[PDB]
Amino acid sequence: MIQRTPKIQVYSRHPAENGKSNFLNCYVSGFHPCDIEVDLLKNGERIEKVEHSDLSFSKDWSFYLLYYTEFTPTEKDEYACRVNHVTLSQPKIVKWDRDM
Amino acid sequence: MIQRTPKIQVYSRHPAENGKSNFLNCYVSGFHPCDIEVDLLKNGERIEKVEHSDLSFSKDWSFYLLYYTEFTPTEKDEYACRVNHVTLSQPKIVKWDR
Numbered sequence: 298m299i300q301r302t303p304k305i306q307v308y309s310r311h312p313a314e315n316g317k318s319n320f321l322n323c324y325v326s327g328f329h330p331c332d333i334e335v336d337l338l339k340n341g342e343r344i345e346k347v348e349h350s351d352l353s354f355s356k357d358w359s360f361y362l363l364y365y366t367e368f369t370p371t372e373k374d375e376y377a378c379r380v381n382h383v384t385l386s387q388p389k390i391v392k393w394d395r396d397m
Numbered sequence: 398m399i400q401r402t403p404k405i406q407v408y409s410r411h412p413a414e415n416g417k418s419n420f421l422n423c424y425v426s427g428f429h430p431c432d433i434e435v436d437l438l439k440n441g442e443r444i445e446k447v448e449h450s451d452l453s454f455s456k457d458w459s460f461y462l463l464y465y466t467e468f469t470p471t472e473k474d475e476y477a478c479r480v481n482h483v484t485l486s487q488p489k490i491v492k493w494d495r
Contacts, residue, residue: 331431331452351451352431360452 298358302384303328307377308397313370321368321393323378326361330383335364338377338390344368370395401459402484403428405491407477413470413495421468421493423478426461434481435464438490439474470495 303325310320323335331352337344347366354360368376376393404427410420425435431452437444450463464478476493 331433349454351453353451354449358434 298329300384301327301329301359303333303380303382303389305378305380305389305391307391307393309368309370309393313395315371316369318367318369320365321376323364323380323391324361325364325380328360328362328382328384329358331358331360332383333360333362334381335362336379337364337366338379339368339374341377399429399458400484401427401429403433403480403482405478405480405489407491407493409470409493409495410465415471416469418467418469421466421476423464423480423491424461425463425478425480427455427457427459428461428482428484429459430483431460432483433460433462434479434488435462436479437464437466438477438479439468441477443479444468 304327306324308322313319321337323337325333325335337347344366347364350363352360352362377390379388379390381388403425406424408422423435423437437447444466447464447466452460452462455461477490479488479490481488
């Protein structure tokens with residue numbers, strides 16, 4: 298497989314509501330090679346106990362990986378996913394759109 | 398060292414009986430880093446139609462990956478698993494033994 302840079306989706310499990318518990322997700326996909334670093338951020342700082350799936354792929358070694366954690370959004374807090382990969386010269390930061 | 402060379406096991410789901418439908422498996426495990434190439438081979442040639450698990454994280458910080466394929470063995474056909482990994486000087490071929 299050739300080098301391929303990741304696609305990134307950030308989304309919550311349920312329709313977001315301030316003060317209500319939820320799950321925050323970062324899905325990284327279509328990438329190669331498999332080594333990748335992903336943080337979920339709250340107000341720009343790393344969230345510590347985030348979990349992830351295994352590395353999925355179909356016919357080719359083009360990889361798919363989900364990072365997720367419980368969270369309770371509030372009006373003041375903003376969330377993001379930060380991804381580093383060999384294809385990336387600097388970390389890529391994708392903000393969470395509240396509507397997703 | 399955090400690099401770990403893959404353990405490679407090649408085995409059929411049932412013991413070998415020419416003519417009966419079976420499964421060929423290559424279980425590659427205990428490796429680090431995750432970057433790896435695994436191919437199932439029939440007579441030295443890559444089998445195009447194969448199945449596999451996720452490339453999976455172990456509790457000891459290593460990885461594993463299973464490749465498998467439906468096949469029907471015969472007396473002539475020979476099978477192997479080829480694995481390439483940073484810890485190996487050249488691709489490693491491990492033959493299947495009935």
